[PDB]
Amino acid sequence: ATPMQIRCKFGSLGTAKGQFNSPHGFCLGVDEEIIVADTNNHRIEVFDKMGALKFQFGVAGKEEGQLWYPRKVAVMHNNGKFVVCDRGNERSRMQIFSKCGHFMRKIAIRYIDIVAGLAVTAKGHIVAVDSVSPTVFVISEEGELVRWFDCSDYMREPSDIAIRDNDFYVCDFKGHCVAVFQDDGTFLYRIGNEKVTCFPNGIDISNAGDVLIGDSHGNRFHVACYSREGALQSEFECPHVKVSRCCGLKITSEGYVVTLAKNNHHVLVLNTL
């Protein structure tokens, strides 16, 4: 496996600016800021790629505009708005914030149990995948349910999702693979398997269209790189350092790999050797 080096490791357990408490999700921003859903502190934290905090937003609570254990975050490429999913009254809740972090609106998602994966398409549609009843939902910026399709026959437990142009690649945490769907919802094929991609919890798609699938089975961060059609190209690991368990996977334009060490309350930015 090709080694990965630590380019930046930032965060520690706490409440202070730049600290985390069990962060469950992250994304990249319009300017590829590292944007973290700092779950147990009820806030979003926005960083540059060397871990410098730009700003944070979020007050703990269940009022509209407040955050309550936010676990997933995405940014709308065309206007910088944040899409944040947390726990509302009883069930999951989706809220839209401005690029300043100001509450704009709540999107009713009573048809979703758990948001296990969150992404935004090129056209500006919000994609949320449910892990309990495996289902994909495509949602407009103004809250319209544009499309949904059932994937329970083809998936066990979704854990992340990525989109390239118009197909959906869904991480199957308990299926040990990625499931590929069209925008139609028509299933196409799977990428990976239990040998290489064990308990995958992160996926992103390189510019070239390759599929990067992250896992931390051996308590070290491992990445498998597949072609768009499912041919294993390479594997990556951090052999010279003992990386913790991680979740999520995003590729920066430089080719750096970003993941979240949820159980150790920090972000990792990695480069290939």
Author numbering: 931 to 1203
Please share text taken word for word from the publication where this structure appeared.
We solved the structure of the Mei-P26 NHL domain at 1.6 Å resolution by molecular replacement using the backbone of the previously determined Brat NHL domain as a reference model. Mei-P26 NHL folds into a six-bladed β-propeller with a donut-like shape and a diameter of ∼45 Å and a height of ∼25 Å. The two molecules located in the asymmetric unit are connected by a di-sulfide bond between Cys1030, but the functional relevance of this dimerization under reducing conditions in vivo remains questionable. The six blades are asymmetrically distributed in a radial fashion around a central axis. Each unit is composed of four antiparallel β-strands connected by loops of various length and degrees of flexibility. In the center of the molecule the six β-sheets form a solvent-filled channel with a diameter of ∼12 Å. The overall structure is stabilized by a β-sheet complementation of the first N-terminal β-strand (aa 933–940) with the sixth sheet (aa 1178–1202) in a molecular velcro-like fashion. The N terminus of the NHL domain remains invisible because of averaging of its conformations throughout the crystal but is present as there was no indication of proteolytic degradation during purification and crystallization. As with Brat and Lin41, the NHL domain of Mei-P26 and Thin/Abba also exhibit a highly positively charged patch on their top surface. There is, however, one notable exception: three amino acids important for the recognition of the first position of the RNA target by Brat (a uridine base interacting with Asn800, Tyr829, and Arg847) are conserved in Mei-P26 (Asn970, Tyr 999, and Arg1017).
The TRIM-NHL protein Meiotic P26 (Mei-P26) acts as a regulator of cell fate in Drosophila. Its activity is critical for ovarian germline stem cell maintenance, differentiation of oocytes, and spermatogenesis. Mei-P26 functions as a post-transcriptional regulator of gene expression; however, the molecular details of how its NHL domain selectively recognizes and regulates its mRNA targets have remained elusive. The TRIM-NHL protein family shares a common architecture that comprises an N-terminal tripartite motif (TRIM, consisting of a RING domain, one or two B-Box type zinc fingers and a coiled-coil domain) followed by a C-terminal NCL-1, HT2A, and LIN-41 (NHL) domain.
